[PDB]
Amino acid sequence: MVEDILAPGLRVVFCGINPGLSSAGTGFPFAHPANRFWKVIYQAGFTDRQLKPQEAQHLLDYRCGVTKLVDRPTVQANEVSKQELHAGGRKLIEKIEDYQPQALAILGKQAYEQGFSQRGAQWGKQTLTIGSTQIWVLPNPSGLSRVSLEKLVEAYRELDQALVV
């Protein structure tokens, strides 16, 4: 079971689709060795050192949190159904309304579209918000995504720079 890492006063709450097997197995988010999440948030400015999956709770030190749209673990994210994505959207909205971070970063266009009942979304900052929380759509960092580390870092850095101080 992979627990949420949330608290008040956060800059960003990163939300993935669901847990891969490594994550479900270790209990830490983005635990597969090939997932670029930890390296990306470091190069993009969210953390000042590259955290290892077991140090996930320490993301709070950098005022960042982690959650997921769907709880069910799967080998690949694409194994999650669109109906699952949607039921996850309601609980996610309640969580963000509770914790009130400056921004919610959904990792994956499909995840955003299904969870929030949106269509033809563009990458980056959306006009939709959850209260004062901004909504950003970022590329998924799993090693299975065809996005290069460079594009990943560029996209995440845009968010880091948008949230001043």
Single out the residue of 18, 22, 28 nearest to residue 59, CA to CA.
28
Question: SS3 of 66, please?
Answer: strand
Spatial distance between the Cα atoms of 134 and 141, rounded to a whole number of angstroms: 20
Single out the residue of 40, 14, 75 nearest to residue 156, CA to CA.
40
Q: Which amino acid is at 102?
A: Q
Spatial distance between the Cα atoms of 35 and 61, rounded to a whole number of angstroms: 21
Positive or negative, the CA dihedral 133, 124, 153, 92 is: positive
Q: What is the CATH number of the domain that holds 88?
A: 3.40.470.10
Give Cα separations from 142 to 17, 20, 23, 133 (angstroms): 11, 9, 12, 25
Positive or negative, the CA dihedral 88, 5, 11, 77 is: negative
Per DSSP, what are the bridge partners of residue 133?
130
**Running DSSP on this structure, what letter comes out for residue 46?**
S
DSSP one-letter string for 107-148: E-HHHHHHHHT--SPPSEEEEEEETTEEEEEE---STTS---
Tokens of 160: 């880091």
Name the domain count of the chain: 1
Per DSSP, what are the bridge partners of residue 68?
16
Spatial distance between the Cα atoms of 22 and 74, rounded to a whole number of angstroms: 10
Strand ranges of the sheet holding 133-138, from the earlier edge strand across to the other edge: 64-68, 12-16, 103-107, 133-138, 124-130
Q: Which amino acid is at 110?
A: Q
Size of the chain in residues? 165
Tokens of 147: 């996005």
Per DSSP, what are the bridge partners of residue 125?
136
Measured from the Cβ of residue 146, the count of other Cβ atoms closer than 10 Å reads 7
Q: Determine how β-strand 124-130 pairs with β-strand 133-138.
A: antiparallel
Run of H or E including 161: helix 149-162
DSSP one-letter string for 53-96: GGGGGGGGGGTEEEEES-----SSGGGS-HHHHHHHHHHHHHHH
Spatial distance between the Cα atoms of 69 and 23, rounded to a whole number of angstroms: 14
Q: Which amino acid is at 53?
A: P
**Range of the structural domain that residue 22 is part of:** 1-165
The position carrying tokens 């901004």 is 134
Tokens of 106: 């959904």
Classify residue 74 by burial, with Cβ atoms within 10 Å: 0-12, 13-18, 19+: middle
